[PDB]
Design a protein around this nucleic acid. Structure first.
Lengths: 174, 115
RNA sequence: CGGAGGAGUACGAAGGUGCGCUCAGCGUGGUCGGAAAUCACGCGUAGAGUAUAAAGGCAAAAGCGCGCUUAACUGCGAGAC
RNA sequence: CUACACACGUGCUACAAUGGUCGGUACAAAGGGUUGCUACACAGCGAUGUGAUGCUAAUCUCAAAAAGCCGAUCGUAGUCCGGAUUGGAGUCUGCAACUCGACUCCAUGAAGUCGGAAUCGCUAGUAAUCGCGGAUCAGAAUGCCGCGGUGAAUACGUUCCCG
RNA sequence: GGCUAUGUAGCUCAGUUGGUUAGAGCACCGCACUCAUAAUGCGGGGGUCACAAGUUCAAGUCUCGUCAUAGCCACCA
């Protein structure tokens, strides 16, 4: 995207929302990718698989997320690693959004999977995409089991309607 | 290849490979290949991208995988909701087409349960 | 021979220094994943932590990280409790 | 009379390569048929429908024997093995197939990889395996009573088990 | 009145090492053998720790208390 949002979506959104000032025009700040894996300390093979998948879906090196606190109910202790995460900003996040809306959504079997609302009341949107497939990666042979993933889009929009306007302008189904 | 959302075997002949999709049997695969023009005994690895696209377009005209599963679930749930005799049998998880239940109903009612 | 609890250790880093960082709780949203795991944003907020009992303390944090290291030195020591 | 947390007896189909599927192509006996069996043609993927022909039968019909032989393919996999269960659409008998019929087509594709202690049948055209017919009967056989095709292995002996 | 010790399948028992529950043998239930029993052979399923509180790898595996139980000390004038 980039140039498209810079050239028309800004004035178009200002028209849409009757925004008085250029800064009050909403923008999207960051995109965060998360995998939460349990029982990672058991083998660590699945953890390496998670970091590999992240590195392919997003062209950045992920960082492993350590457990905070120690839960008796689960098998975790505060020492062990239990996840992976990446943050995408600027050009990287724009290319990630472009590739997402281009390839992933047609490939997933359920359509319009993102609901209408899925909002926190802060203009920030979250989606949970099942399986590490449905993204440009290695073919199904020579990969581990499928792993779900969390995408979170954090924007400068103040309200849910402003967030929805920004997504519809970008082409997001909802 | 990946057709209709699943990865079919590559070394098997086309007719055998296509029956790996939920919703296609031997007759349906036999008809799809005849409609497209591909020979029956051709292996999947020996098809080109255009022929794979043709097969993927032909598969679209029949219900498959998720849609067919959803429809079957809808029918059974409608029967149970209505509450007729067939829906009652479905609720009880017993034979639905009039087979005896004094003996020989293990497929429907699962493994034996001690008293 | 009144009322209640602890000790007979641990640590070459859990010591030194330079630079850097703040806890805990609750509420929304988000795959497996829930009362409670990891991710994002808010609201009140030291109620967290300090190898270990309690008390007196702790924002220049005395709490938490990273790089380099041996001052866990030798000879002393005005003056005090 | 068909119920269904369970237990037992008698059977059928399998668990595959001495096999499965497709194409071509041989060889029986016995029995039934006028409220019945139907050549042939057309329609249908099919069960079947319509028209029509012969037969009261060594005359016409059920009727395709199947395993077999030749060629291709599958290459040991829960599979091109297996065919339970379930969703959808139909045909026929019958006044009427909900409880509660048989059969056809599409889809689905369960258990099962040779079975513990124990136990059964069989001495030759026998066992094993393959098909065909009938009585009952509007319709409804894996049961019963019959018919043929292919066609084995082993018996030293009476010590023990049963009579 | 004082100390010690113990409390877990239907019964007998091990429990262990605070992650961890737990395992056994009888017994029981199905099958088999038998004219019918017993004896015998085959298969299978079973306890979540006497409780009440606290700390934490809830912990039956530590510390406190209540109850049940067993033992012997309750003396000199």
């Amino acid at each position: 995207l980039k140039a498209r949002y810079n050239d028309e979506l800004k004035a178009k959104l200002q028209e849409e929302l009757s925004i008085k000032n250029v800064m009050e025009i909403p923008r999207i700040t960051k995109i965060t990718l998360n995998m939460g894996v349990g029982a990672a300390a058991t083998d660590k093979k699945l953890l390496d698989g998670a970091v590999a998948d992240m590195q392919l879906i997003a062209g950045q090196k992920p960082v492993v997320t350590l457990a905070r606190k120690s839960i008796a109910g689960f098998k975790i202790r505060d020492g062990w690693p239990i996840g992976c995460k990446v943050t995408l900003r600027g050009d990287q996040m724009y290319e990630f959004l472009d590739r997402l809306i281009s390839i992933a959504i047609p490939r997933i079997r359920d359509f319009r999977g993102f609901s209408a609302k899925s909002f926190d009341g802060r203009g920030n949107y979250s989606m949970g995409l099942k399986e590490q497939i449905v993204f440009p990666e290695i073919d199904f042979d020579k990969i581990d089991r499928i792993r779900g993933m969390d995408i979170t889009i954090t924007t400068t929009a103040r309200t849910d309607d402003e967030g929805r306007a920004l997504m519809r302008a970008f082409g997001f189904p909802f | 290849a990946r057709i209709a959302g699943v990865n079919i075997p590559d070394n098997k002949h086309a007719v055998i490979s296509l029956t790996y999709i939920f919703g296609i049997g031997r007759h349906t695969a036999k008809n799809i290949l005849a409609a497209v023009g591909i020979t029956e005994t051709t292996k999947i690895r020996e098809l080109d991208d255009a022929q794979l696209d043709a097969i993927r377009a032909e598969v679209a005209k029949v219900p498959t995988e998720g849609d067919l599963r959803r429809e079957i679930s809808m029918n059974i749930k409608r029967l149970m909701d209505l509450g007729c005799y067939r829906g009652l049998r479905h609720r009880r998880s017993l034979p639905v087409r009039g087979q005896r239940t004094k003996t020989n109903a293990r497929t429907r009612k699962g493994p034996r349960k001690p008293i």
